[PDB]
Design a protein around this nucleic acid. Sequence first.
RNA 1: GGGAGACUGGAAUUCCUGGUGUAGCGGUGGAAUGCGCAGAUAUCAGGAGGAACACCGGUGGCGAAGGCGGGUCUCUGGGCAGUAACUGACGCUGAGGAGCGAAAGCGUGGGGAGCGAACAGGAUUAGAUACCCUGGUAGUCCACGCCGUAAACGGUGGGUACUAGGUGUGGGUUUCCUUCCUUGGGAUCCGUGCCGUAGCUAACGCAUUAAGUACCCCGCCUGGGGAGUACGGCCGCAAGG
RNA 2: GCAUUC
Lengths: 275, 88, 115, 96, 65, 32
Amino acid sequence: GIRKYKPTTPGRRGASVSDFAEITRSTPEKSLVRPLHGKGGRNAHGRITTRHKGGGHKRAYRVIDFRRHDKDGVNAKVAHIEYDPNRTANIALLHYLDGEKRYIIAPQGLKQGDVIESGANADIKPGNNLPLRNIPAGTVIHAVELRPGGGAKLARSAGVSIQLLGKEGTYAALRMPSGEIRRVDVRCRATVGEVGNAEQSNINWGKAGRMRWKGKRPTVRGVVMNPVDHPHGGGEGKTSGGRHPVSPWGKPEGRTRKPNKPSDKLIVRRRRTGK
Amino acid sequence: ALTAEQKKEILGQYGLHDTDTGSPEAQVALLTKRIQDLTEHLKVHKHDHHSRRGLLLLVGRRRRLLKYVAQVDVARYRSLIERLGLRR
Amino acid sequence: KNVPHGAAHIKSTFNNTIVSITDPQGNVIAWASSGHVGFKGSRKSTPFAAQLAAENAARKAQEHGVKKVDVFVKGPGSGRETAIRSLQAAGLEVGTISDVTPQPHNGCRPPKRRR
Amino acid sequence: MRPYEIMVILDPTLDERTVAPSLETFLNVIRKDGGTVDKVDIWGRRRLAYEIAKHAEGIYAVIDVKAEPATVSELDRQLNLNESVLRTKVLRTDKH
Amino acid sequence: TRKCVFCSKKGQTIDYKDTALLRTYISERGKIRARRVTGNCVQHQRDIAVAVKNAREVALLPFGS
Amino acid sequence: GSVIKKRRKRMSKKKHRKLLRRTRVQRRKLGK
RNA sequence: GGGAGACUGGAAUUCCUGGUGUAGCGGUGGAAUGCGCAGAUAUCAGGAGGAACACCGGUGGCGAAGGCGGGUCUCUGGGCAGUAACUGACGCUGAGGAGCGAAAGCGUGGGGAGCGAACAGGAUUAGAUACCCUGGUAGUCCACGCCGUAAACGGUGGGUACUAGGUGUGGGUUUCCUUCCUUGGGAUCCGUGCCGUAGCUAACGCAUUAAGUACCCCGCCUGGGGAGUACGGCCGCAAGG
RNA sequence: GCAUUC
Ligand SMILES: [Mg+2]
Ligand SMILES: [Mg+2]
Ligand SMILES: [Mg+2]
Ligand SMILES: [Mg+2]
Ligand SMILES: [Mg+2]
Ligand SMILES: [Mg+2]
Ligand SMILES: [Mg+2]
Ligand SMILES: [Mg+2]
Ligand SMILES: [Mg+2]
Ligand SMILES: [Mg+2]
Ligand SMILES: [Mg+2]
Ligand SMILES: [Mg+2]
Ligand SMILES: [Mg+2]
Ligand SMILES: [Mg+2]
Ligand SMILES: [Mg+2]
Ligand SMILES: [Mg+2]
Ligand SMILES: [Mg+2]
Ligand SMILES: [Mg+2]
Ligand SMILES: [Mg+2]
Ligand SMILES: [Mg+2]
Ligand SMILES: [Mg+2]
Ligand SMILES: [Mg+2]
Ligand SMILES: [Mg+2]
Ligand SMILES: [Mg+2]
Ligand SMILES: [Mg+2]
Ligand SMILES: [Mg+2]
Ligand SMILES: [Mg+2]
Ligand SMILES: [Mg+2]
Ligand SMILES: [Mg+2]
Ligand SMILES: [Mg+2]
Ligand SMILES: [Mg+2]
Ligand SMILES: [Mg+2]
Ligand SMILES: [Zn+2]
């Protein structure tokens, strides 16, 4: 759920925080943690290539299993649900009967002690991962591969899910969280369920400093820059920019998907805008 | 609703004699069971207002029976409260 | 093209009449409407206008060789019987008359009452 | 333990000789759960009054079980996940 | 007016299985016949109506033939 | 009784609601 | 069809994809805006999605009232009859108070097919901020809160006893006539209608489901307007109560 | 279809 802060200070008025109710353990698996460091939005040239990044809390990477392909038939039990800094969803530590320990995105409703299984023979129960071929149409799924063996790429953020609409030949038709309908190979893997932590979107961060903790630097509006800095810059007093809205690099607001991408053959229709 | 089995068990414990089903002690004990079970139901079904009205009627009845017991024999009243775990 | 036996779909509403002749597979071979026979406005809802529309579609169907027709009528208009009669008189055989006005099992809210 | 009558409509593309074994395994859920599986009447291929999942016909089975509510709901869920099952229908067969 | 055949001592049980029994109480349009026409009592008419609806869902009877 | 009686009340109520509409912002600013 | 949760069924509207096929379709009292000719309407097949549940279905059932109708399952409230096994006046009503409370509206998050305040055009007209037409946004739907009003009406507070009958219908009991056919008929208990005595009423009407004959408790009225308004206060996010 | 007022 969401816990609302009391208005004891201007910075806290209106703000809220996760109740972290699903969290069972406060520390990660040592053997599944890798180091991570901040990039500040700078690339190999040391140039800022993504603005508004830097200054966030230090965090470590939990190795998430996005393939789940080498454990068909080996059941696992959910040992813990824990917080991950690197994504909106929570993560579930699985103990396989192999004695292997792996992290997976925690689906909605998955509790400690549940049994999870993988592969063609698995039951259609939240957290079970199996080829789309064996997933009946109409089911809600997440963490879907784009290419067989490529690893889960779609529907990974907290609360999101994909609906498997149907199967025809080698392809399954999927409705994306965005609403776009697209085809994927039926050999591609998916996990049954929605993604957990769906309440996170309702959090009111409350104050500038908390976004700084999350690594977001301030965004200066174009209209308050000078012409040399931004096409919207300039003018005496307040202005609307003095021209059609453009990026800081002058690109107009239009479609930016490249024409004639090969994936255009797999896309049935694009998302609808302003429905 | 209470089954014949659950009713027999409750009456065997709180009836003042065998075959007793009508004494306030027996009735309050039956009411207390019903109420507990209905409270369990209303924890799951928050919006079942019609069944919760039934609950309030059972509560009112129990109160009146308890008021009768206290009017007749305070000793039986205190025994009944403590034996059932009621507050008042 | 040629087809010996077909179906006639007649949709008669309070404003118009639309007859279409079709193969049993549902592909339309000919059609006519009260506006296609030159009636405009309210005149195109009269039974006489349904007569002419049914006749015109029947003639166009004879061209493609239709001999016998089963008629499916819907709608609440006044050019249903007239249309059946005009199909027969224009030289088509009418086997079955079946009425298939779409009826909801309590579905979408009707538009509000006129006053 | 309450009596329940389960109607199942199976794929007509199946063979009837293999229908009976496949239902029996599906019904083990009840026997492991402590309930009974009395009668598994298998009607033959009949014409459906309307097409279901593009099928004009299907195989009707009637299964009478005494079991706990939880176990019969588990059975139905598995049945509806099976590809060969088209439509199920569970009816409690006792007063109220 | 006419009596309710299910109140008689011979009255057949009403089950959604029995397509041939239920056929008595639906029109050729497939519609459930009014009790005022059939003579059924209130209780048995309810049974018939429910049995017919269950029969339609298990595709033993049509939705409006 | 006669609808006349209802009509008298109707008018008074309607005019009051319309007055409350027109003064809504004024009542807030003067009530602060 | 008393309530709550979960799953699920078909018809129809709309859209989408693809056939067939053209030049009209749509709408009215009569028209025009509108949709088409860039391939509509119509017809056939497949897909998506939301909402409401035809027939059954009634001046019929259930609920304190508001209200409640596709099916299934799970959990759950009340009522009625029979038997008198049990308790032994434990009853009735209830100032304040608490809870429930149509629709509209409000907050946050979903959903949005159809319908549709506002809003556009078209028409009508002296004008037409309308009625009619074409569109169309909030909303209508879901989750969790808030709001607390309705001709929330039987314009009839609750409990109890008594006071001609006749006749429908819903739920139980029972005696006779007997085929034992059974809407055969009687008695009895509990609902729900119509018609009618006595009695009551200004009249209309009510009339064993009273507005009759009486007893107990509560609420409310005291000429019409001003006004269910102002002021104060309480409640509400606001509307406002 | 339309038909305001005294
Ligand atoms: Mg470097
Ligand atoms: Mg930025
Ligand atoms: Mg996180
Ligand atoms: Mg945010
Ligand atoms: Mg800024
Ligand atoms: Mg400057
Ligand atoms: Mg420049
Ligand atoms: Mg200036
Ligand atoms: Mg967006
Ligand atoms: Mg019944
Ligand atoms: Mg609900
Ligand atoms: Mg087309
Ligand atoms: Mg079409
Ligand atoms: Mg009281
Ligand atoms: Mg009071
Ligand atoms: Mg509402
Ligand atoms: Mg508003
Ligand atoms: Mg809202
Ligand atoms: Mg909203
Ligand atoms: Mg309109
Ligand atoms: Mg409330
Ligand atoms: Mg009032
Ligand atoms: Mg009402
Ligand atoms: Mg009143
Ligand atoms: Mg009275
Ligand atoms: Mg009576
Ligand atoms: Mg009378
Ligand atoms: Mg009077
Ligand atoms: Mg006044
Ligand atoms: Mg006031
Ligand atoms: Mg004031
Ligand atoms: Mg004048
Ligand atoms: Zn009967």
